[PDB]
Amino acid sequence: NSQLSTLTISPMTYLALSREDYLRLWRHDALMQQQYKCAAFVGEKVLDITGNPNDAFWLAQVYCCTGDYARAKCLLTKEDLYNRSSACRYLAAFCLVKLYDWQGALNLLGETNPFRQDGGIKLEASMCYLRGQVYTNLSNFDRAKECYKEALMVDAKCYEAFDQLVSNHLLTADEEWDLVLKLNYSTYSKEDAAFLRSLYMLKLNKTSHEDELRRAEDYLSSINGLEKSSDLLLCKADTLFVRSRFIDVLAITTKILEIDPYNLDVYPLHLASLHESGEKNKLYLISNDLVDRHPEKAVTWLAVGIYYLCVNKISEARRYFSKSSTMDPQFGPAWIGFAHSFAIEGEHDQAISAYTTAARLFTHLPYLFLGMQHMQLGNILLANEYLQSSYALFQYDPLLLNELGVVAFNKSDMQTAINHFQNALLLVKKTQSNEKPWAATWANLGHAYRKLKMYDAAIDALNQGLLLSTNDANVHTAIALVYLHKKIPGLAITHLHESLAISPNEIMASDLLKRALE
């Protein structure tokens, strides 16, 4: 009944001929060939002759494909047909939704699943999915989530329902894993259950069930043909990106854009990786024609904002991230870009606003950024609350370890600080990051060493510091002060000279200098 799908009632089941057989084969092929004048004319004739509900259903298909939803509904709701046929009830309900009749949709479907194997998706499941589509449009988000999970519980093949839960961030990271774990993959195939489960794991978050995810990608990888799959590849690059392995990510992403140019799912990851890789030209190339090709997509205006980032036109980048997030308020990557552009230009509350709206979408990353922002504001309790929430998520990001280090440092836990900075430098070696920004971690390590009176370690790290970024007055001042401590006024002097030449007004440099003078 509603356990079956659309395949049960396909004309091709005849294979398991009358005039009404011929007409059905004919209308069916006309529909698959999208010759709709033809399918409507044959579909009308067969229906007139038989009055068969399955003929009514297929006739409404063509009206649906035509965009004639009002007409499909009318034909299906006129003769109690929605009551004689699960497929009709589904299709009528499908039309009411397309028509925005939310209340009438629920009248066919019922507010709860009323029903609680042919190769298709159980119509019971599809109706649960539609039921969720309605509650979403009634903004009843609690019961949409719930009525979507019903769908997947009923037939694991209801990927539309799954796609809603995930791409609409309707669940926790754990909520999602918990769900694709408890599915009845026998509604796909008892044997080979594993195949479908692995496929679904490719969509879940990369950093909570690293064991199941690894066993999943491994099994899929052995299946010939799937190495060329975008979903598999896209998953691999998400993992890679979490590990800061940006060249690797970029090797994959790029392969995706050549072998399947029309999928735009890849861009936020490709754009983000190029920003870190500092490819202004690729970012100019890619955005320009994105604006030229897809002016309507939020993705393209994210690409434009990001270009203005590796070029430090912050007022402009803020302008196009603003545009990109007003187009699609649900587009996470754009609120991050937005937020960052405030951070850069010193506006804390606005960045924190954008950050916390960005966190709702999506991950250790937003909590990390919120954390970095309160630290700049000097709110150490809040900074720590966030960094900790971010560390519980993922403990292996060198940027997060730097921030924990700087918090430990600000509460004077020097030994824990040093531990954090040292691990941050371990992790960084394993990455494919640009190295000039990590000069800050080297200097941080030197500052912790300075505070524990261990001055020879401080000199080494501080020096490893400006090595990575040579145009830096503060580390010269840093180094100078460590020399005064080592009672070597002369080397402190040469270093204070270098930093005073770099920043001639420096108040601390100047005072610190007079004192070294012997």
Binding site: M372, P398, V406, P437, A440, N444, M508
Partner: peptide, 23 residues
């Protein structure tokens, strides 16, 4: 997601004062 750069501890007046505990 766009990342950003490691925060940098900087030298402070408290740091010069700290030194001035040369006594």
């Amino acid at each position: 997601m766009l990342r950003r750069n490691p925060t940098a501890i900087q030298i402070t007046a408290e740091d010069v004062l700290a030194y001035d505990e040369e006594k």
